[PDB]
Ligand binder design. Structure first.
Ligand SMILES: [Fe+3]
Length: 186
C-alpha cells in the first residue's frame, strides 16, 4: 500500500519499506518519489552548494540497500555523460529545472556520441534511468536559478564511468560526498 509521503522524513520511512526486500519495484518507487511535494525547509540542511561545480549531499544510507542524496547545481553546472554501475537511479527535482540528455552505449570504435533525445525535468518530477536504458548527462542550463535534485541509487555505488562525447571513450571516476547527514565532509 503506497501512501503519499507527508514530509521528506516520511518519504525516507516509506523508502525503507520499499527496499526491505531484495528486489525493487521501480514504478512504485518512482511514484512515491513523485508524490512527495518538495518542501525546501525540510531539505535546507542538505542543500550545500559549491560555486564551481555541483555537489552530492548524502541524506540516508537506506540500511545498505540504497543511497539517497541531494545534488545542488549552481547556474550552468552539469555532469559528465555517465552510467550507473548496474544500479537503479531515480532523480526527482526539488527546485529548478534540469536538462537530461540521453545517449546510447558507445561501440568500441571511436566515434562522436550523438544524443538520442533530451528533456527538461521540472520541479517535483521524478525520472528514472538504468544501464539497460542507456547513459545520460544532467545539466542545470539556467543562468539565474540554482537547481536541487533528490537522487536514489540502488544498490549504492561509489564509482562509475564518464564518457568522452567526442570518442565514446570511458574513464572510471570515484564519486565523493560533499556532506553526509548535513555535515560537510571535506
Ligand atoms: Fe545519472
Amino acid at each position: 500500500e503506497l501512501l503519499k509521503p507527508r514530509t521528506l522524513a516520511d518519504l525516507i520511512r516509506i523508502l525503507h519499506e520499499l527496499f526491505a526486500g531484495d528486489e525493487v519495484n521501480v514504478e512504485e518507487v518512482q511514484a512515491v518519489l513523485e508524490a512527495y511535494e518538495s518542501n525546501p525547509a525540510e531539505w535546507a540542511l542538505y542543500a550545500k552548494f559549491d560555486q564551481y561545480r555541483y555537489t552530492r549531499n548524502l541524506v540516508d544510507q537506506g540500511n545498505g540497500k540504497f543511497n539517497l542524496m541531494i545534488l545542488c547545481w549552481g547556474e550552468g553546472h552539469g555532469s559528465s555523460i555517465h552510467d550507473h554501475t548496474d544500479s537503479h537511479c531515480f532523480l526527482k527535482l526539488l527546485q529548478g529545472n534540469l536538462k537530461e540528455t540521453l545517449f546510447d552505449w558507445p561501440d568500441k570504435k571511436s566515434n562522436e556520441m550523438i544524443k538520442k533525445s533530451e528533456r527538461t525535468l521540472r520541479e517535483n518530477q521524478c525520472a528514472y534511468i538504468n544501464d539497460s536504458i542507456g547513459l545520460h548527462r544532467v545539466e542545470n542550463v539556467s543562468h539565474t536559478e540554482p537547481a536541487v535534485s533528490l537522487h536514489l541509487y540502488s544498490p549504492p555505488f561509489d564509482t562509475c564511468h564518464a564518457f568522452d562525447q567526442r570518442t565514446g571513450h570511458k574513464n572510471k571516476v570515484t564519486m565523493t560526498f560533499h556532506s553526509k547527514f548535513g555535515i560537510r565532509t571535506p
